[PDB]
């Protein structure tokens, strides 16, 4: 069976560079082997097929090279559609058989984080329930820190936290910080606040509100 | 139009099995191949097997355990994978793809998103959410909605029907107590909002659901 190295497994690249992936095939494939771009919960997409023939709808962006065990994925000039994963598959030998896949990063301008609050709807009170959610979006680097504050005292229990990966929108990252209580608990406080620490600023963004 | 269709998710009991279906839309041949393509959780692309469904002859992987028998059925032109005896090491999207006879996959399947577990469905809560009055814009504005308590896995979120797609995030699922939980975050000009309305989508295809909810300002 057909062994398919894909190295690096993660690739770095400033905006308008030229990339090229790697793909080491364990023995000679000929001219046999496919590229596959896949995108965030999303579904794989041919870019290039046998070796360096181009797809159309595909842009001339994209190209390929290589034969028998080497072979070269190139994207001239990177941009921010092209941050996905990167898979190669041959077709030389049965079974057909997948790379390991390599991850497209950009090094893009430092970008401070938009930090939004919103209060716990009036349909979720009902419910007796009571979620207050923080958003800090399109920042750069993706290291960030968030802080809750409840009244001026800070507050961790009840937080759930998650990251989006790098946007294929803007080579940004963006980060969703959710905190959860009971109606009874929300509704004998007064200040929310939301904390956001990141290296564009040595001041942090602060979103909050009352809930009278 | 969308060449193969593959339902969004499906939920099965430890040790149960399911049948994954395919159909397919588009030129149809003799010659056309139906790949299966398994792919966990923040993995890559594994190879299943494959079918021809002109004879009804399939081809398993030998290096992985045996979890599917494949068939077709011709006079709905539809595809069948049947994953037996399933446990955790199971859960995971599997893709549906056509191949031409030439090697490579020309076309992908939307996916099969199947988890395993013991759990029961359980569909989400969607609350809107809208800036409090006394929060300050500049030339954007953002709005977003909450997508709480659901089970299992996944769950579709569109902005005004899928005409709002840029300036979208959705932010991964959080699970606690066989619960999952997620946010979607939109951002438009300020001065569009609310005079223009602003609604998001959730689908859920576990529970067959979909709902929309609009973003108005706190009165």
């Known amino acids: 069976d057909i062994l398919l190295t894909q190295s690096p497994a993660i690739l770095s690249v400033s905006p308008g560079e030229r990339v090229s992936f790697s793909c080491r095939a364990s023995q000679s494939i000929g001219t046999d082997i496919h590229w596959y771009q896949q995108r965030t919960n999303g579904s794989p997409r041919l870019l290039i097929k046998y070796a360096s023939e181009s797809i159309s709808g595909i842009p001339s962006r994209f190209s390929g090279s290589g034969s028998g065990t080497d072979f070269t994925l190139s994207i001239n000039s990177v941009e921010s559609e092209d941050i996905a994963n990167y898979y190669c598959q041959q077709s030389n030998r049965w079974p057909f058989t997948f790379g390991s896949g390599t991850k497209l990063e950009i090094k893009r301008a430092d970008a401070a984080p938009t930090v939004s609050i919103f209060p716990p709807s009036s349909e979720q009170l009902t419910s007796g329930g009571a979620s207050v959610v923080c958003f800090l979006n399109n920042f750069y680097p993706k290291d960030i820190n968030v802080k809750w504050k409840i009244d001026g005292s800070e507050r961790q229990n009840g937080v759930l936290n998650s990251w989006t990966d790098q946007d294929s929108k803007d080579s940004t990252y963006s980060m969703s910080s959710t905190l959860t209580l009971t109606k009874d608990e929300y509704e004998r406080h007064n200040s929310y606040t939301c904390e956001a620490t990141h290296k564009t600023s040595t001041s942090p963004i602060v979103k909050s509100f009352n809930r009278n | 139009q969308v060449q193969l269709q593959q339902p969004g998710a499906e939920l099965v009991k430890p040790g149960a099995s399911v049948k994954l279906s395919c159909k397919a839309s588009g030129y149809t041949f003799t010659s056309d191949w139906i790949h299966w393509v398994k792919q966990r959780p923040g993995h890559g692309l594994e190879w299943i097997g494959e079918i021809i469904p002109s004879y009804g002859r399939a081809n398993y992987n030998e290096k992985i355990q045996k979890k599917a028998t494949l068939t077709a059925d011709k006079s709905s032109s539809t595809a069948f994978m049947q994953l037996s005896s399933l446990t955790s090491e199971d859960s995971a999207v599997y893709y549906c793809?056509?191949?031409?006879?030439?090697?490579?996959?020309?076309?992908w399947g939307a996916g099969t998103t199947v988890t395993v577990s013991s759990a029961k469905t359980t569909p989400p809560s969607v609350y809107p959410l809208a800036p409090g009055s006394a929060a300050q814009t500049n030339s954007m504005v953002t709005l977003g909605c909450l997508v709480k308590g659901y089970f299992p896995e996944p769950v579709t979120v569109t902005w005004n029907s899928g005409s709002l797609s840029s300036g979208v995030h959705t932010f991964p699922a959080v699970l606690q107590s066989d619960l999952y939980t997620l946010s979607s975050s939109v951002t438009v000009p300020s001065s569009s909002w609310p005079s223009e309305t602003v609604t998001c989508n959730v689908a859920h295809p576990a529970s067959s659901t979909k709902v929309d909810k609009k973003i108005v300002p706190r009165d």
């Open positions: 793809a056509r191949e031409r006879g030439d090697g490579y996959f020309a076309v």
